[PDB]
């Protein structure tokens, strides 16, 4: 990683440009060495704000909500340099701050014009111990189209979510009226869902110096199969905790063994 910094004490113009500087660097590992670089802009809102400060200083009339008249171009001239050219591609993970919790606020609204996916980190999920604490129902992607990920991928994914949704429904019932008017059917959606929720968690190699556990980088193929089978009913006999913090389904099997 190369780190580029635009600290909060820097004047508008500096916090304004540092995301371009970082961009410059990344474009090299693509236009000069044709790799697949990763660009991280933390956070995309302070980019926009820096834009407004600069704008105001240049005495230009603000537009709706006080932002810059050039909000959309200031963003476009930067966002657009982030793509897959014939030489390689830059992929950007942008930390978003939504003002006033207003998703139609000009800053945020403009920004979604460019996003192809959202990764929603959730404190609730974390509380399940589940990590990465990504929310499987709130996180989204433009490319989750069978015409793009292929029917299999697309169906598994849509399978995982519905089940996760259904279980969500039952969640209310379980706690109140108690876990049993539950059908041979309603009891399976839960079981699997709970297996799934766990199978969606995973050990990171970045946290090895700490979790005393080995990181896993599951492959896409392994991912779709994994969930495919749980949906399928291939491991209904396996127990929940067999799936907590593992990589490929094979590990779910072996953990079960060590868990008698």
């Amino acid at each position: 990683v190369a780190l580029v910094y635009g600290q909060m004490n820097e004047p508008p113009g500096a916090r304004a440009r540092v995301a371009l500087t970082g961009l410059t660097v990344a474009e090299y590992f693509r236009d000069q060495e044709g790799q697949d670089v990763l660009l991280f802009i933390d956070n995309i809102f302070r980019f926009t704000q820096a834009g407004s400060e600069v704008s105001a200083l240049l005495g230009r009339i603000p537009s709706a909500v006080g932002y810059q008249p050039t909000l959309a171009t200031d963003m476009g001239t930067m966002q657009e340099r982030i793509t897959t050219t014939k030489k390689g591609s830059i992929t950007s993970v942008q930390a978003i701050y939504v003002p006033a919790d207003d998703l139609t606020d000009p800053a945020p609204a403009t920004t979604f014009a460019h996003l192809d996916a959202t990764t929603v980190l959730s404190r609730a999920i974390a509380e399940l111990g589940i990590y990465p604490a990504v929310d499987p129902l709130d996180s989204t992607s433009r490319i989750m189209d069978p015409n793009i990920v292929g029917s299999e991928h697309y169906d598994v994914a849509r399978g995982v979510q519905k089940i996760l949704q259904d279980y969500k429904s039952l969640q209310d019932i379980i706690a109140i009226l108690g876990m049993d008017e539950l059908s041979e059917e309603d009891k399976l959606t839960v079981s699997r869902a709970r297996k799934i929720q766990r199978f969606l968690s995973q050990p990171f190699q970045v946290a090895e110096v700490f979790t005393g556990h080995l990181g896993k980088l599951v492959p896409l193929k392994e991912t779709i199969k994994g969930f495919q089978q749980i949906l399928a009913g291939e491991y209904d006999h396996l127990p929940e905790q067999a799936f907590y913090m593992v990589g490929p389904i094979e590990e779910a099997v072996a953990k079960a063994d060590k868990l008698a």
Partner: protein, 263 residues
């Protein structure tokens, strides 16, 4: 549309939604238990009615309304009351009894001087034969030598429907002494006295067991809707709030610019 007011409204609707979702789940639990205990009750209550339909009973020549004390269950009470007023009108002397405070507050004022008794503590805890026996006893120990009575309650049909119905109370030990009753012989004039008393408790019990099932399923339904309306209202006020928030800033800023440019 003041960010203050909007906020005031959101505040009270978020609580409503919370209290309303709670009330729904409690009800659906009470309902679930009630739906089941109702299986046997019907067979039992329909059994009690097995004598009179299987063989005529009319009357030569007491309106009991059952519901509960708690509202927020759609039209459970208004229905029985509505049909209760209807009878008292079309009719022969008039005397009435209401089980569940709500009846005593609704088909009331107009007909207080037309009361015999009223019952409280109905609906919170599941009804019992025991409660029915208290109602029956309280009546037998009343100076109303009713010749014929009717019992009005809500007959369950499904979580999304019920029907206010009436059941005849030919309890008149006197009426049970008609021609049609000549088919059954070897009946002491006072063995019936016991028979009628009993079948009186059975019919009150039945209506009672049908009523709470209708009531808990209607409160569940009513509170499902209320809660869903609330949330929708919440989602709308919030979006109205942000539109307003953005326009005030824009509006206040254009005003400053106009003044400044004019100089």
């Amino acid at each position: 549309a003041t960010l203050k007011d909007i906020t005031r409204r959101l505040k009270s609707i978020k609580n409503i939604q919370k209290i309303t979702k709670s009330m729904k789940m409690v009800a659906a639990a009470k309902y679930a238990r009630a739906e089941r205990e109702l299986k046997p009750a019907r067979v039992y209550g329909v059994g009690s009615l097995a004598l009179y339909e299987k063989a005529d009973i009319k009357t030569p020549e007491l309106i009991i309304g059952v519901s509960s004390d708690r509202g927020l269950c759609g039209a459970i009470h208004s229905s029985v009351a509505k049909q209760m007023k209807s009878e008292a009108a079309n009719l022969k002397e008039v005397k009435i009894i209401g089980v569940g405070d709500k009846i005593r507050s609704i088909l009331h004022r107009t007909h207080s001087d037309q009361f015999l008794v009223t019952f409280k503590e109905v609906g919170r805890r599941p009804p019992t034969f025991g409660d029915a026996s208290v109602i029956a006893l309280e009546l037998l120990n009343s100076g109303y030598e009713f010749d014929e009575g009717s019992i009005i309650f809500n007959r369950f049909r499904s979580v999304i429907s019920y029907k206010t119905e009436e059941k005849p109370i030919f309890s008149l030990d006197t009426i049970s002494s008609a021609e049609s009753m000549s088919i059954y012989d070897d009946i002491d004039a006072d063995v019936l006295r016991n028979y009628q008393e009993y079948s009186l408790a059975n019919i009150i019990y039945y209506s009672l067991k049908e009523s709470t099932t209708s009531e808990q399923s209607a409160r569940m339904t009513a509170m499902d809707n209320a809660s869903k309306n609330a949330s929708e209202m919440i989602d709308k006020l919030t979006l109205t709030f942000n539109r307003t928030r953005q326009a005030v800033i824009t509006k206040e800023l254009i005003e400053i610019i106009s003044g400044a440019a004019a100089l």
